[PDB]
């Protein structure tokens, strides 16, 4: 390989032999594109003029009132498509074209990556095929028909938990038979190398902009940046540019679901065990026997029984810290942002916000400057949240 | 060893191997053991056996459902090893290969897994989601416990891969019929002669063709192309699922098929 | 009055005598705020850091392929809240605070102004009360619960056509009894002076940014700028900075509904007759007897039987031109943008796009540089559009 | 003129005016004409009459529904003028005022509208959505056709407005009881003495109080405060809607009420 597939013990390329050429082709295309000024210009142009970068960094003064916490929100909810997923999808689509692929296979849970895949494919002339768990088709329905309006085929997956893991499995199976014409647009910083690396580099502008914006507004770096962790893309996009700024805490937030003690959660980094699946060596939720467990979250986007290898590594060395937030804590944060800042956050992003609000409330006289990655908007979640209100 | 003797004997009788695949414990421990006995009796030269895994990423719906049935019967990897011991105890010479996914091997330690394979009398292990690129700790553990590590030669294989597979592999070389996942419905059409010849040049372990082989004509074609044998999975498993109501009519329909497939290898 | 309430013959302050002090107070507050550097800085800060200005100007290369038309879209769909409505709502909310008001009355049709009113009120500490026609509650439902999540009271109006006009009537009646504590946040560039003037000045950044962005990308001004016209706010926001650039065509697009000849439309500027209602002298759809007619559009946001006085004036002098686009033409444009640019536009904005696509297709070898105001995103319209597809 | 004679005579009998309001053609042309006859007979000193408008922005639900009923009976402005002619033909001296919205006046030309009012014998016109600020063409047209233009004195009125209303108005000054829209359920509580006194100082046309007056006690209070009379709309109209099934029982209940209200003005 051209690049290191591992982050400490975590990562690698644990795919069938048939798929290694595709992975090698992708790696070579990426390394080449990174050195290509024309690629970089085309990518920059789509991000700025199509997706609407740079996104805002909003100071939330109402929600921190009466405390010594200053909170900013990095507004990826304002990105075209409604989430940070759009960033790296535009980059991967350009790599797909560079590799002469005409088709796109993707998987989606919250439907935000699926929307992103569909819009990029519509824009750049690719045929897009999307796997989504049938439970997620229901609970994240507005996204299902956004995808279909933009010319994408949406394929409901009924097997297993009928959520994200099962969508991934189907997408992987499809790709192993169609890699010659189809690029697999993996939607997070996980899976086989080179995906964890590529997804980080194409999400890295989140942290770079945040750094420039916070220095401009505050004259210094944040005490901590805080992001939810599904597979790890929005978090690593935020974290990446701060990794060498040792004074800046990096907090990743896994879904605690109904509570860690119930086993109905999606927190394998802190509560799972290293395993091999999804093409990588990474923490997973697994039985004693080594079968992969089903995860659970109120949010479809965090409902995944593994995590990307770089977060597993940053945790092990102590550089980043990971915590969990329950369904109920995420819901309170959702309601709080709606009512006091007039922003409706995705339920995924609400986990990140919830933890920030905990840091504030637990120690209200601690002076802290925090940034939360608001990875998406919550329009897709409004029916779900409505139905829970009542009871 | 058992593979070596098998290919030696098959060479002398100038025929190819027929190697069926089933999921251990599908549809139950006892019926599976009877299914396997029927397979060997009907003319199976070796066996390829899957341990039920939650997420079989290289398998289509047929074998997916095979895994599900075994899971409904509550089949664990520990029970699979107990079955393997019983199969070896009844059949001392037949080569036995396991189809594994990496997590089941890595779970309790890679070394311990192969030590256990040796202990029960397994001859080879193929880990489906470990390419040569990640194979080192797996192939080292295999060789330490006298287990053949099985490597895959795909249709898109280049010369560098051909030589890797040839030196690292033991027992047999898995020659893939096509891209995609396991499935009887999808047959591999591409000619594989040039890959078969090069493996022989670099002195790879004898080649077995697998994926999509569901008819005696396909077996015959594989052997006539120079491959040492053929593997059939989903075709066999379809007979299990379509005859779940009829255990006796299952074994008869299994027997007919395996005989017909083995005949084609002659 | 401090400012001229009329644009030629059109405009004025045709409200009950009781409401004149409120109108005079608002006018004085606005004139004062316009000269206040602190107001302007606070307004600029909310627009940039909260709402996400400047918005992108996107070149659409796929949809113009094979023609000599170059088309840009001003991306107000990327503004926080999902539409241009957010701009002037932030300004009016700041005026409400400056006038010591604690409450907000608003009306909404597409629900985008209602969402905007609710979010601004949540952010700036105001109690928000919103009137919406019961038909619009149904056809623009995602917006109904966005409003309620942010702490706003949503009041369904069943009388009359149960659409926008009827929402306005109720809001007006409410305000005439509660003007002492409540600011009436009128949602368009229509109604009594000073509203047409204030709404323009607080939407004016649309055209100012467009001008700067097009000069940067093209080195010259557009041949025409094109905007849909409900009451006139997004169009006047786009038009305003170009009014003195005589080479730049200004095209406003009214909804043609089922067709002008059916009488089921919302195009009073070109197909109505001057009347007095909604506090202004303006073109309206009215019977021979002078009763106000019910309008019709597939889009709730254009479904209003009048138009703002400044557009009526710009038309009369020949400075701006107004046209209509039918339901079916707007739907085709909606589908076209989704599938070929990966942007899902509001059905309101789709009228503007439809007319631009007509200018292109009717004369495919005419060299023209056009800007369409993409006033909002179409997430609110996806269920409606789905249901029409089938038949 | 008719107003002048009315207030002159009322001054001599030392009492206030009771001026009911109804919508012309509610619930039908014929029943409305009978309702109005009952109103005058029961003691109405003058009349305030609404022409059905599609969008009555100054009216609450009661009078809104009055407009709707008239529209169901197909009542047009042309029919309203025909009714007015019949009312004047039966009652030569009673002051008749119209409550108009601006579009109905502006529709066929402001001048033509007031010319038509004069022609049928209307005494005054109040245009609800025309404040003094927009009143010029309306008040000029009124005076040219010997129509009193009615101006509103709201509770929030300052001195500049007081003097405007006093010079521009004829016939009577409308003294508003409260902010809001028409409605019997909502009564105006604020003291209006200081406004009544200042109108008299600038020699405004005599004041009539309206909005929310639904009881004899309110009438009595208005006159005792110095106002020349009181106007009641929604209270009257509620009797029309609650007795739609009973036309004869409607007129009896209307008669009782108007008598009781007029008595309070004495
Ligand atoms: C607004 C928001 C999301 O939508 C989201 C996720 N969404 C998915 C699931 N995606 C698609 C393939 C995938 C595999 C594993 C895990 C997540 C995802 C989607 O399909 O919209 C995440 C969390 O994702 P991370 O940033 O950690 O990558 C945060 N915020
Ligand atoms: C995305 C978009 C809209 O949402 C929209 C309108 N929306 C309304 C109706 N608004 C609210 C009060 C009102 C009164 C009259 C006409 C319109 C409106 C709303 O309540 O979201 C218009 C058209 O509006 P104009 O830009 O011409 O002002 C264009 N684009
Ligand atoms: O007849 P079919 O199509 O069901 O094929 C049966 C195959 N069963 S198997 O155990 O050899 C088998 C061998 C290799 C596999 O994956 C890998 F190639 F990626 F390694 C999967 C299954
Ligand atoms: O008894 P209520 O509360 O129904 O009041 C009845 C009033 N009917 S009216 O014609 O005098 C009347 C007078 C003025 C109106 O509007 C304005 F004040 F803005 F000009 C509306 C109705
Ligand atoms: Cs921006
Ligand atoms: Cs604070
Ligand atoms: Cs997770
Ligand atoms: Cs073009
Ligand atoms: Cs309109």
Query: What characteristic shape of chain B results from the CA principal axes?
Result: globular
- Summing up helix and strand content along with how strands pair, one would put the structural category of chain B as alpha/beta
Helical content band of chain A: 40-55%
Oligomer state equals heterotetramer
Tell me which protein chains meet in the greatest interface and how many residues each side has: A-C, 41 and 41 residues
Summarize the structure in words.
The complex is a heterotetramer, with two copies of chain A (391 residues) and two copies of chain B (266 residues). Chain A has 391 residues and is an alpha/beta fold. Helix content of chain A is 42%, strand content 18%. Chain A has helices at 20-34, 37-51, 85-98, 112-124, 134-139, 141-149, 164-178, 195-201, 205-218, 233-239, 268-271, 309-316, 327-341, 349-362, 382-388; strands at 6-7, 10-11, 57-59, 69-75, 103-108, 127-133, 153-157, 182-184, 224-228, 249-257, 273-277, 280-284, 321-326, 368-374. In chain A, the strands form four sheets. Chain A has a six-stranded mixed β-sheet with strand order 3-4-14-9-10-13, with helices on both faces. A four-stranded parallel β-sheet of chain A has the order 7-6-5-8, sandwiched between helices. Chain B has twelve helices and nine strands. Helices cover 49% and strands 14% of the residues of chain B. Chains in contact: A-B, A-C, C-D. The A-C interface holds A 48-52, 55-59, 62, 75, 78, 80, 82, 118-123, 125, 142, 145-146, 149-151, 335, 338-344, 379, 382-383, 385-386 and C 48-52, 55-59, 62, 75, 78, 80, 82, 118-123, 125, 142, 145-146, 149-151, 335, 338-344, 379, 382-383, 385-386. Bound molecules: the ligand CC1=C(O)/C(=C\[NH+]=C(/CN2CCc3ccccc32)C(=O)O)C(COP(=O)(O)O)=CN1 (2 copies), ligand F9F (2 copies) and cesium ion (5 copies). One copy of the ligand O=P(O)(O)OCCNS(=O)(=O)c1ccc(OC(F)(F)F)cc1 binds at residues 21, 48, 50, 58, 63, 99, 126, 128, 152, 176, 182-184, 210-213, 231-235 of chain D. It is classed as lyase.
């Amino acid at each position: 390989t051209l690049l290191n597939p591992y982050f400490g013990e975590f990562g690698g390329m644990y795919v069938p032999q048939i798929l290694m050429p595709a992975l090698n082709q992708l790696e070579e295309a990426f390394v080449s594109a990174q050195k290509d000024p024309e690629f970089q210009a085309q990518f920059a142009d789509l991000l700025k003029n199509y997706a609407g970068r740079p996104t805002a960094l909003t100071k939330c003064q109402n929600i921190t009132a009466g405390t010594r916490t200053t909170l900013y929100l990095k507004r990826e909810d304002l990105l075209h498509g409604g989430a940070h997923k759009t960033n790296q999808v535009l980059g991967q689509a350009l790599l797909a074209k560079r590799m002469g692929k005409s088709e796109i296979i993707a998987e989606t849970g919250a439907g935000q990556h699926g929307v992103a895949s569909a819009l990029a494919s519509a824009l750049l002339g690719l045929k897009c095929r999307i796997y989504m768990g049938a439970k997620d088709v229901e609970r994240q329905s507005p996204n299902v028909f956004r995808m279909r309006l933009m010319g994408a085929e949406v394929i409901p997956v009924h097997s297993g938990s009928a959520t994200l893991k099962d969508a991934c499995n189907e997408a992987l199976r499809d790709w192993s038979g169609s890699y010659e014409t189809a690029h697999y647009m993996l939607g997070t910083a996980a899976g086989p190398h080179p995906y964890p690396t590529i997804v980080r580099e194409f999400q890295r502008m989140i942290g770079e902009e945040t750094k420039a914006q916070i220095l401009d507004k505050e004259g210094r770096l944040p005490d901590a940046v805080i992001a939810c962790v599904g597979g790890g893309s929005n978090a690593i996009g935020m974290f990446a540019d701060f990794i060498n700024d040792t004074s800046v805490g990096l907090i990743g937030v896994e879904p605690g679901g109904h509570g860690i003690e119930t086993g109905e959660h999606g927190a394998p980094l802190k509560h799972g065990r290293v395993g091999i699946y999804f093409g990588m060596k990474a923490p997973m939720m697994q039985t004693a026997d080594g079968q992969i467990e089903e995860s659970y979250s109120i949010s479809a986007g965090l409902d995944f029984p593994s995590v990307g290898p770089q977060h597993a590594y940053l945790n092990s060395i102590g550089r980043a810290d990971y915590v969990s937030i329950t369904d109920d804590e995420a819901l309170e944060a959702f309601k709080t942002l709606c009512r006091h800042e007039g922003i409706i956050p995705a339920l995924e992003s609400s986990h990140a916000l919830a933890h920030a609000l905990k840091m504030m409330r637990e120690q209200p006289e601690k002076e802290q400057l925090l940034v939360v990655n608001l990875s998406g908007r919550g329009d897709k979640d409004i029916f779900t949240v409505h139905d829970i209100l009542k009871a | 060893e058992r593979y070596e003797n098998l290919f030696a004997q098959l060479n002398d009788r100038r025929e190819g191997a027929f190697v069926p695949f089933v999921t251990l414990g599908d549809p139950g421990i006892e019926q599976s053991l009877k299914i396997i006995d029927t397979l060997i009796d009907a003319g199976a030269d070796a066996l390829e056996l899957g341990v039920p895994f939650s997420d079989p990423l290289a398998d289509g719906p047929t074998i997916q459902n095979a895994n599900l049935r075994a899971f409904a019967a509550g089949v664990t990897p520990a029970q699979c090893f107990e079955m393997l011991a019983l199969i070896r105890e009844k059949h001392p010479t037949i080569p036995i290969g396991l189809l594994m996914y990496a997590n089941l091997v890595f779970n309790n330690g890679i070394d311990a897994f192969y030590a256990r394979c040796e202990q029960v009398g397994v001859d080879s292990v193929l880990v489906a989601d470990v390419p040569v690129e990640e194979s080192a700790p797996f192939r080292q553990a295999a060789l330490r416990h006298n287990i053949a590590p099985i490597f895959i030669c795909p249709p898109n294989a280049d010369d560098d891969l051909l030589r890797q597979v040839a030196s690292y592999g033991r027992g047999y070389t898995y020659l893939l019929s096509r891209s995609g996942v396991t499935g009887a419905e999808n047959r591999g059409a591409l000619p594989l002669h040039h890959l078969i010849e090069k493996l022989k040049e670099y002195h790879a372990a004898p080649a077995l063709q697998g994926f999509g082989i569901s008819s005696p004509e396909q077996v015959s074609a594989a052997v006539r192309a120079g491959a040492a044998g053929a593997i059939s999975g989903s075709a066999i498993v379809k007979i299990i699922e379509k005859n779940l109501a009829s255990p006796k009519q299952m074994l008869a329909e299994l027997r007919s098929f395996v005989s017909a497939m083995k005949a084609a290898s002659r």
